[PDB]
Symmetry: C3
Subunit: 88 residues, 3 copies
């Protein structure tokens, strides 16, 4: 079936749910006012996520795997970019 | 194989481990006094979870996927209920 | 494809990413100074993880599943050991 990963922060809370479906990962967001589709959309058959706070900023890392290749995607306040993670 | 998701809170800690096995998700709980089977039992081939605290209350969200349908299950102090999440 | 699980702590942060690949789980670590391969290497087709702090100590629980058997692996400051978790 489809495969999901979830993270949350604060007391509202904000929630992010990533779904790997048919080889692509999309993102659903809850910030207390209804679910909506987030900016993240990248290839992947499997997804995991972790997030942390630094002061009042959220940092998200999404690990997207297709075949034996895992790409780390980073949210640090200004869009998603590929991170330095490799599996080695 | 079977597929799991885990979350934890506090310093004991409390741990919840969800296992999707043969199309159903069950829940194992640790609160410092041995593992036991929790109340959660719902359909699902894949599971993810996140949890947060608000004061001294735990909130748990379990994302249960069967086929292309993902159901959010909510624990907010008084049993499990379906939440508003949709994948769209 | 391969399957991952991720956790993080602190503000650096420290990140641990577990990958189940070809029936074994390995561990990649980030502590602010580059990714490296961690000590964890055990059988598993599926992996989940949770971690918590107690004061200034990290506790990690990795749930490694092969077939219908799930083994809990514990990091509590001094190597990985099997924990008491069972699925029942
Ligand atoms: O719109 C909300 C948003 O900016 O929140 C942070 C990330 O989850 C983004 O992908 C998402 O679009
Ligand atoms: O700022 C981005 C970055 O340095 O954040 C920490 C890790 O996720 C790294 O792989 C990643 O490149
Ligand atoms: O008995 C412990 C319990 O109430 O803890 C909160 C939830 O994890 C429930 O499913 C579970 O049964
Ligand atoms: O109180 C339940 C609820 O509002 O909690 C926040 C989100 O998990 C929603 O989908 C869900 O319906
Ligand atoms: O070297 C860093 C390390 O000790 O950090 C704690 C655990 O993640 C270990 O498996 C890992 O080797
Ligand atoms: O100290 C190890 C241990 O007691 O930690 C809490 C749970 O993870 C248990 O299954 C595990 O045996």
């Amino acid at each position: 079936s489809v495969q999901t990963a979830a993270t949350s922060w604060g007391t509202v809370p904000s929630i992010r749910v990533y779904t790997a479906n048919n080889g692509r990962i999309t993102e659903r967001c809850w910030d207390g006012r209804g679910w909506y589709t987030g900016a993240f959309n990248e290839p992947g058959d499997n997804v995991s996520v972790t997030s942390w706070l630094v002061g009042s900023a959220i940092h998200i890392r999404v690990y997207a795997s297709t075949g034996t290749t895992t790409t780390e995607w980073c949210w640090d306040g200004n869009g998603w970019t590929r991170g330095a993670y490799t599996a080695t």
